Amino acid sequence: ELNIIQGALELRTKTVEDVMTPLRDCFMITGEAILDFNTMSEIMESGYTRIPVFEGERSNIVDLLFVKDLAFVDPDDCTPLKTITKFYNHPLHFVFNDTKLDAMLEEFKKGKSHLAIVQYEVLGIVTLEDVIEEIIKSEILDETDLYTDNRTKFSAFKQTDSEMKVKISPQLLLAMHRFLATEVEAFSPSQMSEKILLRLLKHPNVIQELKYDEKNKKAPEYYLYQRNKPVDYFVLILQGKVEVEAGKEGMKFEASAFSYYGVMALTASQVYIPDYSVRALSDLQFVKISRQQYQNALMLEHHHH
Amino acid sequence: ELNIIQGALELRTKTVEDVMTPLRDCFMITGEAILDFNTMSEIMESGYTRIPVFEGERSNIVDLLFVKDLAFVDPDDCTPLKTITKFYNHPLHFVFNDTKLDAMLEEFKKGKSHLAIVQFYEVLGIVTLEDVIEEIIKSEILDETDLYTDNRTKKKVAHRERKQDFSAFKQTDSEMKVKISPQLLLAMHRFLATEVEAFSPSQMSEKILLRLLKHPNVIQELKYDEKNKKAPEYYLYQRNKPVDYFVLILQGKVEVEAGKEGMKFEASAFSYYGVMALTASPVLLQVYIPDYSVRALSDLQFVKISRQQYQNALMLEHH
Ligand SMILES: Nc1ncnc2c1ncn2[C@@H]1O[C@H](COP(=O)(O)OP(=O)(O)NP(=O)(O)O)[C@@H](O)[C@H]1O
Ligand SMILES: Nc1ncnc2c1ncn2[C@@H]1O[C@H](COP(=O)(O)OP(=O)(O)NP(=O)(O)O)[C@@H](O)[C@H]1O
Ligand SMILES: [Mg+2]
Ligand SMILES: [Mg+2]
Numbered sequence A: 001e002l003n004i005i006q007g008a009l010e011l012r013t014k015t016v017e018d019v020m021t022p023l024r025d026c027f028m029i030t031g032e033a034i035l036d037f038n039t040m041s042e043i044m045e046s047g048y049t050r051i052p053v054f055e056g057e058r059s060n061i062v063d064l065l066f067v068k069d070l071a072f073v074d075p076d077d078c079t080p081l082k083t084i085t086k087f088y089n090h091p092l093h094f095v096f097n098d099t100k101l102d103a104m105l106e107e108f109k110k111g112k113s114h115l116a117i118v119q120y121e122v123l124g125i126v127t128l129e130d131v132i133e134e135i136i137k138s139e140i141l142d143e144t145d146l147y148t149d150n151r152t153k154f155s156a157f158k159q160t161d162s163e164m165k166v167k168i169s170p171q172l173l174l175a176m177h178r179f180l181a182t183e184v185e186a187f188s189p190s191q192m193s194e195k196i197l198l199r200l201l202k203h204p205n206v207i208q209e210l211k212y213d214e215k216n217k218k219a220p221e222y223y224l225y226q227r228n229k230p231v232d233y234f235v236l237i238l239q240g241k242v243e244v245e246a247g248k249e250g251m252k253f254e255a256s257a258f259s260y261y262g263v264m265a266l267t268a269s270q271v272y273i274p275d276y277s278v279r280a281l282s283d284l285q286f287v288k289i290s291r292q293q294y295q296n297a298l299m300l301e302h303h304h305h
Numbered sequence B: 001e002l003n004i005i006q007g008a009l010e011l012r013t014k015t016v017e018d019v020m021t022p023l024r025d026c027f028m029i030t031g032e033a034i035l036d037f038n039t040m041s042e043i044m045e046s047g048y049t050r051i052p053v054f055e056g057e058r059s060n061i062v063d064l065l066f067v068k069d070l071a072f073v074d075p076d077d078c079t080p081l082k083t084i085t086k087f088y089n090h091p092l093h094f095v096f097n098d099t100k101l102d103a104m105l106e107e108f109k110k111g112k113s114h115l116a117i118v119q120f121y122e123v124l125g126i127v128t129l130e131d132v133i134e135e136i137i138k139s140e141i142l143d144e145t146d147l148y149t150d151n152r153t154k155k156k157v158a159h160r161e162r163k164q165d166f167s168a169f170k171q172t173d174s175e176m177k178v179k180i181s182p183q184l185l186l187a188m189h190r191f192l193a194t195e196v197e198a199f200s201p202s203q204m205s206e207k208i209l210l211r212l213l214k215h216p217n218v219i220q221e222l223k224y225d226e227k228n229k230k231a232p233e234y235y236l237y238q239r240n241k242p243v244d245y246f247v248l249i250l251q252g253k254v255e256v257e258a259g260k261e262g263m264k265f266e267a268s269a270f271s272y273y274g275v276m277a278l279t280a281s282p283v284l285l286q287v288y289i290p291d292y293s294v295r296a297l298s299d300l301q302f303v304k305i306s307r308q309q310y311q312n313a314l315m316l317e318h319h
């Protein structure tokens, strides 16, 4: 409890440069940047709430970007960063290198930004948390933040399609992974780690599409399932509309994306016979997992020790 | 700045309650909420990074939502908050009110969620790192909405800037279509073919009527806003306001105020209105003006045929 008092008595002497983060170690984003899934994944993997937006050279910091700004962003839209910065237009908080931490804190208290640029040769950036970690004499962290300013230290966003059999937007795959890991116990984390689930979803020929042709509208090729015909594979619609004819009387209803079928085919029921038929009414794009594949994924999860 | 040097002596004895936020004034979110546009707008207007998540009563805080967990959420998808809160499953730091701020700061600096719920356990409130720091330094810190520093101080700063009327982001809200069962379609089809003469086989063969009913936008829905009542957009028919479209209520309730004296009655399904609007005879031309006002009392699903469409259907005369 003496470290806090020490730091308090020493704040009038220490300047921003004593706790400054060199410009070489700053996490920046160019203003001429688009918020496609890859850029947003790179933004989030750093776990930095406030990121400076620079135009041209890195020393030219022109705006700010808050992770809280990425709420209504759809990575599918691939919106440009300029539109977001214009809608929000965060205020720049400037400071000089020859400043005392007392004045720094006085500014941050009512300041429009807890992140400030230290300069007009820009050297780096200082945040309220730096000042307070220096005062308290003990470092801080919300574990989302990567490391504690000493070059020493979660799911990597590696859900990107790079020219494979079928094309789906990374945001779609992410929603798939989330929905399966959450609302289906067969793919729950407790039974199968998320990394293994992701490997399984992007496994070749698992995710597949299907084109609709009025000619063969009721052909056996467009039937993902047939009543009282055994199968061994689990389906999860990603895009499209399907007609489910269920029950012994054959009640017909419609189902769109994120409607899964035949979970028991994967786990032990032994045999799985669905009392329903799933026909395609449009272009379908879905996941198809075989019992063998699910068992292999479980083998993977139990093999890592 | 001398307060900082004694803030330590205070942190060794103070308790969370001295600087705690009261569970009564905490902005929370229901456990079963959906992260649609409206809910996301609430969340982002409140301007709070961490939001407790309770199931049922406010005292049963079970989860914790981070705003960072919304980066890859689409308000258009209407993603349930349950999936996110169960997928990220951020841990909760439960604490007792008799917790010296020393151990509190020790726990916070460790990495556990900065927001800790202080508590047949009873809920006491919320404790944040910035709260302990504002108590130590005895100063005000603010980048979220409210200026309250330690306890009981409602205030306004910069004209409540965080609430920015986000409606510009919204999607068009254009329903892809209206789903009517095949059986409801057949029932409506037959009812119009029989009772109403305009749609009778004498003037429209079955095929042309089916095409007109399957035509785009003829079948429509109308959501009921219990608060925004009597809106001029919810009046299918206005009294003595020329109209040119025939209606047929398939599902829902409507209040019909008819007669100059204005008697109001309640009509439900298969109660159609303004059939003469379809007639196109020479005469602001050959106007039809109804003597009634039809407004909605519940969600409506109906047909709505313009005079155009009907006369086109009649123009489809092929022997
Ligand atoms: N954009 C950034 N790039 C690099 N380092 C940063 C950045 N922002 C803050 N830091 C450093 O990260 C450490 C902790 O700062 P901090 O203010 O906690 O970041 P943060 O947690 O992301 N913001 P907050 O959400 O308020 O906690 C300090 O050493 C800062 O200098
Ligand atoms: N869910 C909540 N509802 C109402 N008030 C809250 C809530 N969470 C925190 N507060 C209060 O809001 C103040 C701001 O907390 P704060 O630690 O700044 O959150 P935060 O800024 O989003 N996290 P950070 O980015 O590190 O600053 C605190 O003093 C709390 O008293
Ligand atoms: Mg931090
Ligand atoms: Mg989308």
Ligand SMILES: [Mg+2]
Pocket (backbone or CB within 6 Å): B130, B143, B144
């Ligand atoms: Mg804050």
Ligand SMILES: [Mg+2]
Pocket (backbone or CB within 6 Å): A074, A077, B076, B171
């Ligand atoms: Mg959108």
